[PDB]
Amino acid sequence: KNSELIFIPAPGIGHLASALEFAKLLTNHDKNLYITVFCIKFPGMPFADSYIKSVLASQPQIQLIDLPEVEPPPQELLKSPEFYILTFLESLIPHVKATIKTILSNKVVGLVLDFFCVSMIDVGNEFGIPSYLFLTSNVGFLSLMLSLKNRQIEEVFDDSDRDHQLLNIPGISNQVPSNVLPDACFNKDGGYIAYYKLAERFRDTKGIIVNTFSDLEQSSIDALYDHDEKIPPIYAVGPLLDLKGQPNPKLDQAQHDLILKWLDEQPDKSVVFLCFGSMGVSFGPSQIREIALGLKHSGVRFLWSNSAEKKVFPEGFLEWMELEGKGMICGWAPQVEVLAHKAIGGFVSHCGWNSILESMWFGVPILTWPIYAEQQLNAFRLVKEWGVGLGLRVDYRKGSDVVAAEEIEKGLKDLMDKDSIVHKKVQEMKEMSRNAVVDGGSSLISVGKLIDDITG
């Protein structure tokens, strides 16, 4: 009674980890379920067969297969990250098809695709294999995507003309402003194209699985259904977290120890952790200097993760940290290990989905600073829907003016203020997020139904 699923995730951090965690989650709930993961090399850069294979504790039911590398797109499409990936992935079609045929057996029960790989549904179709969608984001994002059915092909959401006009999208309860919409929605350079080409097929999958939980978004899932029947079942099976923590870019831990030892010396819940995603979107010098001054004036202790050159900081800043020791800067960080630390009391996040889920898992309040993509949307809903985060910005993006130290300092104080409201809902979101994946929890129930539908 063996069943096999083919997993084709997208290259990255917030797209590969949760993918494997999902593989482990499923195989843990069906001894007879085996999974093949097609490891695809993101244009040259690592993050491939080193992490996807390391986390692979030889898990018997999870196999790894490397697809040969390919000539990335014309480095011209970089104008649009979205349109860049969509093209690179579509170029992997011949190989994808090729590889499936080579391992296809009457035991292959379906393909599990990342949102950016949803175009490959036509390959599975050729082999009579149903395809499932794996969204590393939330249901609100799905809705935004599922809401584009009422669009054209040449247009580009508001035609890049956004200001203060509200949009009504089935899925999110609150009216959604234009400024929280992802960058691709306005990217008339292939950005809107990609989101459209991809969202086109959502309703063509056998089921859509989402890295979220019921207590957090059942209301939207029910609204998506209630609003449309052509939509396949949705499976909330999250959170899907890598509580272990990606080893690299840490071959050893010389610095890994520095960060934790430093946090071990701070008063409980006094530190605010700032970190802005894996990509490492480095803010310009001005923004860095302003965030630095903001931090000093605020008086809060802090662990700031960034990739800015030392000379960029305001004069006196670095000395002041290494002397008064109220703060510290570092490059790549053990985010999960950090958020797990008891000294942490606040998080200035870019609002990537995982960062938000990990933060909720540990009951750490968030001061929002979205940057690229659906981050604004996450930020928007975080502050004005689930009330678990304070807003510094929710419409910020690559192009906005610099955020002044004054604003930052204010947000900082509000976020660390113990009597703020944000601290309340947070502990509740922690309970909920954690009761979601225990036996009897809403996500484990979903896993069973998903595995049942997959192998029935």
Add this chain to the structure above:
Amino acid sequence: MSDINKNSELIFIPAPGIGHLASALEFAKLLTNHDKNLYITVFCIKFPGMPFADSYIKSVLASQPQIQLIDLPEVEPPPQELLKSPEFYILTFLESLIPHVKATIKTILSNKVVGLVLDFFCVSMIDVGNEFGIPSYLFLTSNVGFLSLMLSLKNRQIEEVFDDSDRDHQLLNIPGISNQVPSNVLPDACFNKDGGYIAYYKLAERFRDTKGIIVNTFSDLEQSSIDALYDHDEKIPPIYAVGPLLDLKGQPNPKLDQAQHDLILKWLDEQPDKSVVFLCFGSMGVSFGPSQIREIALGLKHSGVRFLWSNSAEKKVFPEGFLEWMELEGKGMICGWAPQVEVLAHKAIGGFVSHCGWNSILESMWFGVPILTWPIYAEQQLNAFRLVKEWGVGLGLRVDYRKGSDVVAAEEIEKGLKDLMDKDSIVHKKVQEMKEMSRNAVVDGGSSLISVGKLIDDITG
């Protein structure tokens, strides 16, 4: 007989505040200095909510037997909520004074009165002038470039406002302006949809109803521009280039006492020749945001150049330890208001970061000082564009900066400064040639003095 036939009188109604007033008085003197029988009466538009009182003027018009000042009933200013566009706020104001202009005129009218000399923003008086058979003369405190844009507005109705979204490679050709002027350099008023574009129109529309247009510029600077204005529209009244009209002494102001005035200049004295950079962004008091201030402060330090920074900002706004450093090494100094011409004339100044107001540019050219352009409001953007792309007498930091622009970072400022102060800069040689030309304009036999002669002859003819 009895010289009665020669006497003549002019009525001066300029716009409020320096930048507009200073040019008006210096023009009154130039004229009165060239016709011992021409008398001028200046209407002091007593702006409600502005310093420049009779204290400023009566300083320059002291001992000028041919010039008298007459105040007007300080009428309640228009609603501060119409200030959504400065331009429109002013036009509305100056127009609420007409009743007083017409009243005052009646009280001092005579048959000697040969004309009305009004400020660009006061062209609405032309009619009051006609109510007395008095022709009106337009005195433009800006340059022929600004005239060229203004006169080009008649090529579009009073509603089809310049596209406030497509200012990129959407170049606009403006008669009078040689270079293919961009749209990002067009004044805000051109894009303001709340009284802005309207004002620039209701005012410009009247430009052609004047006996002549007097510009504070000189022939060696824009004769090509002027020639181009006639070749295009055979209805533009005569243009008289009579500048530079500068107030080289500079009048006092509470914002700068003797001590300060003294320390500033004594300080400059200790500085090496052409080692200091002056930074001044107008009199309008238009101040920068905290973040931008800090960026300028860091940019100045990293650049290693001496400096004199005029600005109003709390000490709690500057980079920590910036002021201590400043007054510790004395490599820079900060003042509130500044004796700008005294400074621009001081041997130590080697560069000027200016918001590009016209008087400032003119003073900077007079003293052969290079400017690093940082336009902000009004027509400053166009002035900076021509300052860089046309006359090549200045360097661009930002030729399109305006209300709502990203903060200009220290790295960019630093690099702009080092270039400004570069001994071997193509502009340096062009600046001294400009300095020379602007000064000959007003020596006997100069284009401007020859020009003021035909003007006075025209007015009193």
